[PDB]
Symmetry: D3
Subunit: 212 residues, 6 copies
């Protein structure tokens, strides 16, 4: 099973959203981290089970999240476009090294002991040190990476403390939940319930009779 949109269009639209950025530090760091991690970002999945488990699923996750972030930021002008876009591209980038590969997905030792938050934080700091960038945008992106899961029980070391962090958390939940929730409702006749999914707090969903 592959993504519905082919991979090089996803790469082109992500590069276009890089080109749309205005803050030079943000675009430089994000373009570097996408460019050096290009193949694994374009191939690897975004989890092991229950969401985005297909090949090039990370890329589809990223593109859908940027589209919905563009919608939210167009409706609410108070947000920063560039910081949000960099945070939404870079937040699940660390799973290029947490997971083993597109074939026979498995947690490696580094991702199982560390996690995709802390490995991406240190990768971001290393990129900032290499590109001779020592401004506050690095630390704010590092926070966006740090707290995109929202709460301590789900893996965040710290609660979100910036507007863009809460935006990132809500878009992540909505996108992942909608993808698994559309996958759950596919093989169900209208008027029938769905299978008991696990990552949706152990719930069963109803397809109404009027959805054709």
């Amino acid at each position: 099973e592959t993504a519905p949109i082919p991979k090089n269009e996803m790469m082109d639209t992500i590069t276009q959203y890089i080109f749309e950025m205005k803050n030079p530090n943000i675009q430089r760091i994000t373009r570097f981290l996408v460019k050096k991690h290009e193949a694994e970002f374009m191939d690897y999945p975004a989890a092991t089970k229950n969401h985005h488990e297909f090949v090039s699923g990370l890329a589809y996750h990223v593109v859908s999240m940027l589209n919905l972030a563009k919608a939210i930021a167009d409706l609410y002008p108070s947000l920063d476009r560039d910081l949000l876009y960099a945070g939404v591209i870079l937040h699940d980038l660390g799973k290029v090294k947490e997971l083993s590969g597109p074939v026979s997905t498995s947690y490696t030792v580094e991702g199982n002991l560390l996690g995709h938050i802390s490995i991406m934080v240190t990768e971001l700091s290393k990129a900032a040190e290499e590109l001779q960038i020592d401004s506050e945008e690095v630390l704010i992106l590092q926070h966006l990476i740090l707290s995109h899961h929202g709460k301590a029980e789900w893996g965040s070391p710290k609660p979100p403390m910036v507007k863009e962090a809460e935006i990132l958390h809500y878009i992540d939940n909505l996108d992942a939940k909608m993808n698994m929730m559309d996958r759950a409702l596919e093989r169900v006749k209208p008027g029938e319930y769905t299978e008991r999914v696990f990552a949706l707090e152990n719930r069963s969903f109803y397809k109404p009779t009027f959805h054709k």
Copy 2:
């Protein structure tokens, strides 16, 4: 303090979104409950504290959630536009009878004992019985109004079980949260923290130095 958009434009946009509806039963029921509760919907606030405590705040809340629902539904074609729009309009309608008025906001006996969910379930069923509609559309709207707070600890009798119910939950969270978060960060200089807000799990927020 009033809403930034004057009130009759909000009413015009809500009636426009009524006219955009395709399902006859949904459109008829939603138009009835909008028309009969018109003045209190256009005047009353949408809470007592920490969000939408100003006059005609319910109308701004509803219009903002319709706009963001339009964005999400345009990006995800799987959702039903009509059911989502009706669930957005009717979910905080009950606070026209839970709250006392735009002046000296206070919980009445009916709102404090019952709540804004169980009062609109009853109101929706009365509207369905009066307009001679006995379709599953009514029951799915009862679910949308029933579980829009998302979890039992926040006031939901049941967990959400339909797609538009979870979208209702997330849109309500995001709109209320970003309104209270923008109200918190208005009077804060860049590089300074904000006041410790209560509705956001007792947290503080940092305004970055590059936000002008």
Copy 3:
């Protein structure tokens, strides 16, 4: 398996307790909702599993709770007997439409999506509108219906706020818990433990050696 007391004696005792009522509005509304839902109240069970799963179990549940409520109201004169009796009779009425029937018990779409609480709030309000009764006893009975489970995690939208609501809670839990504990303790030799039942917080019970 049937109830130990035959059904028309249960109906006669419930009608006698209706006749013992002194408040005209309470008596009229309660008699209407008993008379209109008579056959399903007299046939349907009171749950699906772990308690009152036999035919005419709802009637035995109601009669046993009325006996307990008569005892508690006799010892404590501060309670209102009329409101308590009505809240006892009406609180599990909703499972005439939540459940499918005495044979092959299953949750219907209305009961699974809404629940037995929110359907009886609506039914009670509709009965009040039909009998031209618009007094506060309807609202207090709606609270009794609303919060008879007591806590949010068990399905109550609001915590109890009136005395008879907490009495409804404690009589409900005591009656259901005693019946499931008696059913677990039937087939156990003294000096032996019971099966690990699920509805009692996953516990086991010891039958003492001197219980014959």
Copy 4:
């Protein structure tokens, strides 16, 4: 403030309930613990705050719970009347040594460090050793004393595992709740709410307009 019933009638009715017991070991042990702790049982309060804080309030607690246990035992014949009565009498006996006295009630070192449960388990075993009684009745009474608070978070070392233990817990909760709940409702006009009480999970209670 004294109990509504004078003290010597209360001692007489407790001795009458001793006489009504049929099991010789239960009757002997319970009479021993009532006799040797007589004055402090008849004088001391049953808490420091929020319930039974008046002089001779422990006796009122015991008498009211005997009456409620008699009602529940008359309605449900499966329970053992004697062991339930002994558990009702002996469960809050330990506060004769947890509390300092009727005047200036305060926790002593033994009650604060150990608790009223573990001190009555010890007292019960010492009385059993002194009266040359080595039957399972003693151990079941020790379990009644051990788990009368129901859950670990409220002070019970173990969950209840006997029918009379759960009936002990529910009678204790209902009587303490009723006394604090009637004391909250004394000074409140009809149609007015009550003061925010602490031990009722931080709730406010409503007096309906028809209670005179």
Copy 5:
């Protein structure tokens, strides 16, 4: 499977630590309860599953905790050595009557209904009465045994309030956890994970490649 150290050397070391004590009351009580419960102390295990499930395992638990308590007492002079040693010896003594025996370990009715805390507190107070000791030493040891599990959810009636109670809690955690967690990593090759053990909050452990 037996303990690595033979039993009579272990009894000799416990007797040596008894002789090391300076407080006469503590030393007398602790020697009395070691002497009278000697054979079952030297034979019985210290749990049913997941830790110290082998014969003479309770003795190994006690001896290792005395050694580690000696370490903590040597580094931290503010602790009382005698009180700590007595609390370490006597906190799992009660499982000589909770468990059935070294062969076919099973919970008896006394241990399952009551627990090893409440039976051991009673044993301590009975020995205090018999040895004609009425000092605060008995009450502080009663608290040490009462709250050695640390929290209410794990079985403690009261939270620890004395220094040696927290010390006993932490040494008990560290010793039991280290024995179960050394037993988990015995059969695991370097670079491989361990079996998902239940007593360690359902976690898995990694053996590093450089551990030979």
Copy 6:
């Protein structure tokens, strides 16, 4: 207020424990990070409130935990001494950049937004890259730094999975708790209680009458 031990003896004993290490990679990385952060490690405190809030408190915390880790490593030979010592030295090193200084302690933007865990993981990765060390001991130390608070609710991104991680967690608990719990008991007459300390789950502590 200063630490009881003057500072250069603490530096000498930490350097001695560095010299006692046998693993070359561990020893090199740990000496590099101690030497580079030397002055702030020797001056800064280890928290803001409730523990180690005095000047040079980090050094005293580190020295006491090394002594206790030496005790545990001597008693339990299965542990790795070098990895444990490095994890004990480096776990609160990040507070040289989280905190402002020994005078007027306050959280900086980096420490408050990120935390001392994720800063120190990044510093470990940078030190490994600079010293040209790319072996798994870096990753195991990174996990030691990551999970030394033990649970998600206290700030750990991941649960501990290596033996030295659980040992580091327990020694951190014991040392911090003991210093705050000795500080609470200094000004209390024997036979009197202590003030309710916040960091110990709001408990009150008793000083026994026989402690002189």
